[PDB]
């Protein structure tokens, strides 16, 4: 290679290299003052300003400091405002700026930087793809889709754009349309296409259309390190946790929680029925495109380990009971929620996002016939007043073909083998 030095910077190359050596050697403190001296002496030098930014970037890593990183993000931008900045250096500095903005969660700011990069380099296809990721990270699938359509209209064989276009189409329930994009994009082997998310959704799209080749892709994703197994396809995993589709209460160790749910099941049921009868708007239709057909709604009391205060006004006794069990109320990778499913409902085979939780189902109103849940190769039924426990990171599937409603209570717990340290530190899901 990259050309980083403009005309003036070539004349001070010895000073610039000496400062950069201190950074590469890890003498970060001395390197900062070395580049500060160069910025003071040569205030228009783009290489000196980039050195200052990289030193701040390294210092933020060393200190684990968000504030120091914000300084680096400003300096990376300063580089771009300087006169006569070489194209290679301008791209490097703004790319790192956007990457570090994304790291801090400044998704809107990152998007602005990505847009500047595309405007500055209109022929760099990779920068457009990065802009599409920015939109995907902020939840703007409409603009993300437009970006990848723009990429594919110029470079139709770009595998990165293909998998991300296919991902968007699958997210929009354009299942049949998404399959060739996900498949050809993965087959391209282009950088960024070897990703568990695309194996996940290609196999699931195929499953939904009855393409029996789905599990060939699950096997390849497993062989390439993306899935713990062809059955357990969660993507946010702590490696090594005991992997089992169905669990007994005793195997989980949460026997006190299970006893409470089963001893007190009727008060949980009764508050659920009261909400169905008097506040049924608190039940929200399932919104992750997991239904083939039918009606499925959930009334959530806890999510990401946070109590929903208004929701608990609707089931105050149940919330009081559950407050005694931090293994579920503090499970920041699970929920506590009522789940109602009506006849004519089929939930597609799917997997949850993480292997870090186990899922308890407490039966509340279970019709005598018509309702069942498969996890992996084993199908079971609910019973009123009784807890079932399964690892929903394994593929599971639900049918409701009864003649009245089926109400259950879902209680997620931390996987029992996670230490207290892991339970405090894992990002919420």
């Amino acid at each position: 290679k990259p050309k980083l030095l403009n005309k003036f910077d070539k004349t001070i190359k010895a000073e610039l290299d000496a400062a950069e050596k201190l950074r590469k050697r890890g003498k970060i403190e001395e390197a900062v003052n070395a580049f500060k001296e160069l910025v003071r002496k040569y205030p228009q030098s783009p290489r000196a300003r980039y050195g200052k930014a990289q030193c701040e970037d390294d210092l933020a890593e060393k200190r684990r400091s968000n504030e120091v990183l914000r300084g680096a993000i400003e300096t990376y931008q300063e580089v771009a405002s300087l006169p006569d900045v070489p194209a290679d250096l301008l791209k490097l500095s703004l790319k790192r700026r956007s990457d570090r903005q994304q790291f801090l969660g400044h998704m809107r700011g990152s998007l602005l930087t990505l847009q500047r990069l595309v405007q500055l380099f209109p022929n760099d296809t990779s920068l457009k793809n990065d802009l599409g990721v920015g939109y995907l990270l902020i939840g703007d699938n409409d603009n993300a889709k437009k970006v990848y359509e723009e990429v594919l209209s110029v470079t139709p064989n770009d595998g990165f754009a293909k998998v991300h276009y296919g991902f968007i189409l699958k997210a929009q329930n354009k299942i049949a349309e998404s399959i060739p994009y996900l498949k050809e994009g993965i087959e391209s082997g282009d950088p960024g296409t070897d990703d568990g998310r695309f194996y996940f959704h290609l196999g699931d799209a195929m499953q939904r259309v009855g393409n029996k080749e789905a599990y060939k892709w699950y096997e390849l994703g497993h062989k390439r390190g993306h899935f713990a197994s062809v059955w357990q396809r969660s993507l946010y995993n702590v490696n090594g946790l005991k992997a089992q589709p169905w669990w007994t209460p005793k195997e989980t160790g949460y026997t006190e929680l299970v006893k409470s749910l089963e001893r007190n099941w009727k008060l949980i049921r009764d508050e659920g029925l009261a909400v169905m009868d008097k506040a049924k708007g608190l039940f929200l239709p399932e919104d992750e495109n997991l239904r083939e057909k039918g009606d499925w709604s959930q009334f959530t009391l806890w999510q990401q380990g946070r109590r929903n205060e208004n929701a608990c006004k609707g089931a105050p006794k149940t919330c009081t009971l559950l407050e005694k069990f931090p293994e579920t109320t503090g499970c920041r990778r699970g929920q506590i929620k009522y789940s109602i499913m009506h006849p004519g409902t089929h939930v597609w085979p799917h997997t949850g996002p993480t292997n870090c939780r186990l899922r308890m189902h407490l039966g509340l109103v279970i019709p005598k016939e018509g309702c069942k849940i498969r996890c992996a190769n084993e199908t079971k039924t609910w019973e009123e007043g009784k807890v079932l426990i399964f690892d929903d990171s394994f593929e599971h599937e639900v049918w409701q073909d009864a003649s009245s409603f089926r109400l259950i209570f879902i209680v997620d717990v931390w996987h029992p083998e996670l230490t207290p340290q892991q339970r405090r530190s894992l990002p919420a899901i």
């Binding site: 968000n66 990270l137 991902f167 992750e288």
Partner: peptide, 18 residues
Amino acid sequence: GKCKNGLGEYTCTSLEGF
């Protein structure tokens, strides 16, 4: 959008820095 029962979002965690 959050990944509750499924894995339908591009990312399921929020970026909060260090």
